[PDB]
Amino acid sequence: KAPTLPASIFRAYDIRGVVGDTLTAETAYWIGRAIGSESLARGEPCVAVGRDGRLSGPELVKQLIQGLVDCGCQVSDVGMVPTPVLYYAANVLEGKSGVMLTGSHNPPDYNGFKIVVAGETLANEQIQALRERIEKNDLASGVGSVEQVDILPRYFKQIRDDIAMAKPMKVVVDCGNGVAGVIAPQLIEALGCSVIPLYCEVDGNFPNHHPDPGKPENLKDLIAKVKAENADLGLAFDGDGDRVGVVTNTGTIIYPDRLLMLFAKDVVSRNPGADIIFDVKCTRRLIALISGYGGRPVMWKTGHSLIKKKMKETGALLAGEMSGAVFFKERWFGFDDGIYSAARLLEILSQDQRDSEHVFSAFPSDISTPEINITVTEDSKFAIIEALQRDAQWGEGNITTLDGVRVDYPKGWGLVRASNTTPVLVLRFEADTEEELERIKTVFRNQLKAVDSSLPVPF
Ligand SMILES: [Mg+2]
After folding, report:
1. How far is ligand 1, taken at its centre, from the CA of residue 342, in Å?
2. Active-site annotation holder among 37, 104, 341, 350
3. What is the 410 CA–ligand 1 centroid distance (Å)?
4. Superfamily of domain 248-366
5. How many angstroms separate the alpha carbon of residue 322 from the centre of ligand 1?
6. How far is the centre of ligand 1, averaged over its atoms, from the C-alpha of 130 (Å)?
7. Where are the domains of the chain?
């Protein structure tokens, strides 16, 4: 008989809560019981378990493991590793199920779970099903096992064996005191680089900057060090290693959709007609670029589980999100992995005589706004999107409603979507000229005001 857990920690692509508040030891135990039960129902008793470098790790993980064991599961405990290393374990060990205890890039007090059951990364109704299992006491009982597995050397060797760097490179590596520090600098050195480490000590206090390369302020130290040491590239990993941020030898921030251009060109060169996936926040230039090299561009929803699901459904060889998650299936396993993506980036760059600044600057660049945020209310945020979906007029724009409202015009595009976690509307605009940009911003401004003439529109 299980206690009542807070419904709110069961999110779209993970479970996440505040340790000792909405996420306790008991909470973790029953989460383990729910996952092990679902894994057994899909014919999979074997479950890998990994944890990131958070302070609550070594001890919340005990409850997660005991929960799985009390279902009768055979647990492979891989210890403290990056998230993509846990995903790797769940591809190469006996079982195709895995649980990663991680709070990703959040402040120190947060922790949570990313879940793969019988090959499938859970999302949405599948995660609410785990919650429903606990509420209903619909849970397996058994006497399981625990085996310690040391998987990091095998992962390290798998990548080193696959990657062939052509010239030596000097690379600044910023791990933000997250778990990527267990492997990224060592691996990049082993590839044939000189590595200048920044915040590579694992420290769940995050005493420097939080490991979140999605926010440019967290790249300041990296940019400064790249310039100061005349390095060829700078790399920044998020806390659990599934995302990577890139800066050139001159300190230019390379956004994930532009990084995906380089990877798409590379993957499609070996794989005529390959599907390539990108999310609704990515530049329209990526559509044309994938098409021109003979690939099949596929736009999809944001969210790691949803990308991986779409990968399996389409046979796509590569995917990327604007979050910085890059998903290689070609030569790899199809999951998001910042470390492997860094390695694949270094392989390509090592083969070009130009510096990283010039490799990236050669791609088409349009006029783009930064990401625009409008604070609305929790009551109104989804309804504003729905009102637009019902009644907005966009001329000849090609409308995509996969995730908010995106409109593609011949020479530019715009997106508005509701944040899943904050009372905020998130917008982006791009076009090839200033005049066209103003036209696109105006259509979106007019359509929002048609919903509510009192909405703040700061553009
Ligand atoms: Mg992450």
Report:
1. 15
2. 104
3. 34
4. Alpha-D-Glucose-1,6-Bisphosphate, subunit A, domain 3 (3.40.120.10)
5. 13
6. 22
7. 1-150, 170-247, 248-366, 367-459
Q: Which two tokens stand for residue 306?
A: 């949803």
The CATH topology of domain 1-150 is Alpha-D-Glucose-1,6-Bisphosphate; Chain A, domain 3 (3.40.120)
> What is the rounded distance in angstroms from the CA atom of residue 435 to the CA atom of residue 51?
50
Cα 291 to averaged position of ligand 1 atoms, centre (Å) = 30
Q: Which CATH architecture has domain 367-459?
A: 2-Layer Sandwich (3.30)
HEC per residue, the chain: CCCCCCHHHECCCCEEEEECCCECHHHHHHHHHHHHHHHHHCCCCEEEEEECCCCCHHHHHHHHHHHHHCECCEEEEEEECCHHHHHHHHHHCCCCEEEEECCCCCCCCEEEEEEEECCEECCCHHHHHHHHHHHCCCCCCECCEEEECCCHHHHHHHHHHHCCCCCCEEEEEECCCCHHHHCHHHHHHHHHEEEEEECCCCCCCCCCCCCCCCCHHHHHHHHHHHHHCCCCEEEEECCCCCEEEEEECCCCEECHHHHHHHHHHHHHHHCCCCEEEEECCCCCHHHHHHHHCCCEEEEECCCHHHHHHHHHHHCCCEEECCCCEEEECCCCCCCECHHHHHHHHHHHHHCCCCCHHHHHHCCCCCEECCCEEEECCCCCHHHHHHHHHHHCCCCCCEEECCCCEEEEECCEEEEEEECCCCCEEEEEEEECCHHHHHHHHHHHHHHHHHHCCCCCCCC
Method: X-ray
The region that residue 369 occupies, defined by phi over 0 for left and psi between -120 and 50 for alpha, beta otherwise, is beta
104 has catalytic annotation? yes
Same CATH fold assignment for domains 1-150 and 170-247: yes
CA of 363 to the centre of ligand 1 (A): 27
- Superfamily (CATH) of domain 170-247: Alpha-D-Glucose-1,6-Bisphosphate, subunit A, domain 3 (3.40.120.10)
